[PDB]
Design a protein around this ligand. Structure first.
Ligand SMILES: [Zn+2]
Ligand SMILES: [Zn+2]
Lengths: 165, 164, 166, 166, 164, 165, 27, 27
C-alpha cells in the first residue's frame, strides 16, 4: 500500500503533440493501478518522473494543485491544446489523395481527423457526402454516389476496383 | 483475479493477412478466459494494446463499440474480409510444390487455406481428390489414388517414402 | 511500514554547483517523509549516501551535530550558499526576451525563477505587472494591460497571436 | 500454489530439427510438474506457447485430442520422429576417436549418446566394455582391461597419463 | 532481519590509499548495524564481497580469522598501516594551494590528513598556526593572524573575501 | 516457498579452473537461500542453468543424483580436480621474482599457492624459511634472516627499503 | 521502436538512463 | 564481469542472453 515511482521506465520531456501525452498518461495510470499506490500518497512522489523542461515547469506551478485529479488536468491543459472548430475544416480540404496510396489509409486518416468536432453535430450521410470531392480519378470513374450508403460499402468497391488493376 | 490486460505481451500492427490477425484474436481470447477477468471490465483497457496505425484506426471508430463482442467483430470485419470464392480457387493450384519442401509443411498450408470456403460445401473425398494433383513426380510414382482412402494415410505413406 | 535508507537510489558527490545540491536535498526529504522513517532513526544511517569525495568531510565533522535539521543546514552551509533576495531581483531584469523564442518557454522560465522568494509576499496581480514589462514588440502592440485577468489568459491570447504567422 | 501457463517464458516455433523439440518438450513438462498446475487445466490454455508458423497447425487439428498425453504424442509425431534403437547403435561405432581431443570430452559425448536406449538394458560393466574399443593408441598401450572396474577410474588414469606430456 | 550481505552493492579491490579503505570499512559497519544482522552470522558471508586480487589475499589467510572484529583488524593492518610521523610531516608543506582551488576544498583535505598523527599530541592553536603558512597571497593580505582565534572563523572570513 | 531458477543471470559453460566454479557455486547458493526455494523442489529445476557442453554433461550423468548435496559434490568433483602433493612443490620453485614487482603481490601469490597442502603439515617458521631463496637481490642485501620472525615484519622492512629507493 | 541502447527498454533514449547517468556507473 | 553488452548485467557473453536469443526478440 505504499511505494515510489522510482521503478518506472517512462518519462515525459515535453513536446506539443497528442499521441505522446496520451500514451504517457495512460502508462502512468496503469502503473498506479497495478502497484496499489493510493491517491494522496502518490502526488508527493510525482516529481521523480519529469526531466528537462518539464522539471522547471513543475517547479513553477505547484501550489495550484491539491489532489491527483488536478495534476492530470493541469498536465493535459498545458501540454495539449484543444483545437478550435475552423482549423479542422481548413486542414481537411487542403490535402487531396495522390495516385500512389491505398483507399484504406486515406479513409482512416480523414476519418480520424473528423472526430475532434463536438459530438452530435454530424450525420453519417452528410459526412460521407463531404468525403467525396477528394478521391482521385482512378476510383471516381466507376462507383457512383447514389450506389453507396454506409462506410462499409465504399471500402468493398475500392478493394474490388484495386484488385482488378 | 487481476482484472486488466497490463501483464500481456501481445501486440498488433497494421499488417493485412489472415494468419497474424487470427493468432492475435485467439491469443487475446484465451488470455481473457484463463485468468478470470470480468466480461465487461476488459473493454476499458483494450486501448493499451494497439500501436502505430491501429491506434489511429481505433481513434476513428470508438463511438460504435459497446460490449466485448462487437469489438472483435469490428476487428475481424475491417482487417478480416470474407474473401469471395473465385480468388481462393485461383490462389489454390498456383505454385506447385518444389523438390525441397517436405510433405508435412506443404499439406498443413494447403489445408489451412481451404477452410475459408463456405461451410459444409465439401466432404473429405472431393477435398483429397482436389489435393492429389500438385504433388511432385517423386511422391506420386509409388502411391496411387486407389490405395489411400481418408485424409490421414497419405501422410503415413509419404513419410515412409520420404525416409529414403 | 518499517524501513531505512538502505534501499535508496539517490546519491551525492562533491560537486560545487547549486541545482544539484537543491535537487538532492529535496529528493532525500521527500523520500524520508513518504516512507515513514522515524525522525531520529534516519540520522544513524545517513552515511550510506555519500561518494568517496565527501565521506572524508562527513568523517571530519560528525560531532558538531545532534538532530536531523542541524545536519541538513550544515550541508547547505558548507557546499552551497542559499541565494538572498536581491540577487534574484537583479537576475530577473537582466536579459530581455529575444526575437525568436515562443511566449510559452519565456513564461515558464520566468515563473520558475519567481517561486524562490518567500511565500505570500506577492499575489497574482503584482506578479503579472512585473512580468509584463519585458515582452518583445511583436506581442505588446496588440494585447494591452486593460484585459489580462491573470496568467491563463495571457498564454491564450499569445497562442492565438502566434498561430497567425505574426 | 495456483497458476497457469501465462507466465512461462519458453516457446517453440516451426523448426524441423530434433534437439529443439526435445529440449522444448522437456522444459514444458518439468515446468508443469514443478508449479503444480492441474492435469487437465493445462490443456485449456496450451495455445499461448506457439509462434505464428505453428498456430495455424494447432488450429487445424484441435479436435483430434482429448487429454494431455495425446497432445504431446501428437506434437512429437508430426514435428520430429523419435529415434529407434538401431540408428543409435549405428551412430556409436562410426567416428573413432581423433588424435587430439582430450579423453574427458570423448567420454562425456559417448555417455551422452548412450542414455537414450531404454533403461535397465545395460549395467555399468557391459557399457564400459563397449566404450573401450575406440580409444586412440596413446592410451591403449598403457592402461589395460585388467583394472578399470568403474567409469570413475578410467578418467583418473587418463588424466594422470595426459599430464605427463604423453 | 535478512541476516546476509546478499543485497549490498559495496565492493573492494586492491587499491592502496587511506580514503577508499576507510569509506569501505565504514559503509560495511553501518550496514551491519542498521539492518539487524547477527554479530556472528555475517562472517560466513564475508567472502561474497571481495573480487580480483583481494579474493586471492583472503584465500591466503583464512586460518587466522575467527570472529567479526579480527577480520576488520586484518584488513586495516595489511592494506593501510599506521604511517610513521616523519613522512606525514614531509607530505605537509608540499603543494601550496594554487590560485584556482577554493578555500573549503583546501581546508577539508589538509585537516583530514592531519588526523593520522598520534592522538592528543596537538591542540587547536598550534594546528591553526601550522596551517596558516600556505594560503596564497590573495586570502592573506586582508585577514591577519591576530584576528582569527578558533578553527571556524577562518572559513567565514575566507568565504566573505572570496565572494568578491 | 516455490519458484524456478529462470530469473537468474548466472550460467556455467564449463572451464577447468577454480575461481569460476567457486564463484558460480557461491552465487547459486546465495540465490537459493534468498528466494526461499526448498531442497527437493530445487533439484528438478537445475537443468535451466547449464548451456553448451555442461548441458550434454548433465544429460549424461543424472541417475546417480538424488538430493541437492550429491549434485554439488558431482559438479565440484568433475569440474575442479584436487592437485596432488608434488605438483605444488614443483610449481613453487620454478618462478623467482623479477626486478619490477612490489613485495606485496609476490608474497600474496606465493602464500596463496601454499594453502592447498594438507592442513597442519607446516608451522610459520619453516614456511618463512622456505620463502627465502627466491627474493631478488635488491632486498636480500639488507634484511637478514635472523632479524625477522612472523610475516608481519617482512612486509615492514620491504616497505621501508622500497620507499628509500 | 528506438529501444533504449543500454538498458534494452522501450521507454527513452541513450543520453538519459537511470543506470548510466547515476547509480554510481561510468567508472 | 565484462558487463553484458545488451542486458547490462555482469552475468555472461553477448552471443548468449535470454532476452536476445529467445523471448521472441530479433524481429
Ligand atoms: Zn534506458
Ligand atoms: Zn545478458
Amino acid at each position: 500500500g505504499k511505494g515510489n515511482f522510482s521503478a518506472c521506465t517512462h518519462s515525459f520531456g515535453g513536446t506539443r503533440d497528442h499521441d505522446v501525452v496520451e500514451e504517457f498518461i495512460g502508462n502512468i495510470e496503469t502503473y498506479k493501478d497495478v502497484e496499489g499506490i493510493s491517491d494522496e500518497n502518490a502526488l508527493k512522489g510525482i516529481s521523480l518522473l519529469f526531466y528537462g523542461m518539464a522539471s522547471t515547469w513543475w517547479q513553477g506551478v505547484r501550489k495550484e494543485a491539491t489532489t491527483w485529479k488536478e495534476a492530470i488536468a493541469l498536465i493535459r491543459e498545458h501540454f495539449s491544446p484543444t483545437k478550435p472548430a475552423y482549423q479542422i475544416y481548413m486542414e481537411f480540404f487542403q490535402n487531396k489523395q495522390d495516385d500512389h496510396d491505398p483507399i484504406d489509409t486515406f479513409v482512416i486518416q480523414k476519418r480520424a481527423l473528423l472526430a475532434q468536432l463536438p459530438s452530435g453535430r454530424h450525420d453519417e450521410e452528410t459526412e460521407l457526402d463531404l468525403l467525396f470531392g477528394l478521391l482521385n480519378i482512378k476510383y471516381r470513374k466507376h462507383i457512383s454516389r447514389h450506389s453507396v450508403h454506409t462506410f462499409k460499402d465504399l471500402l468493398e468497391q475500392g478493394r474490388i476496383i484495386e484488385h482488378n488493376n
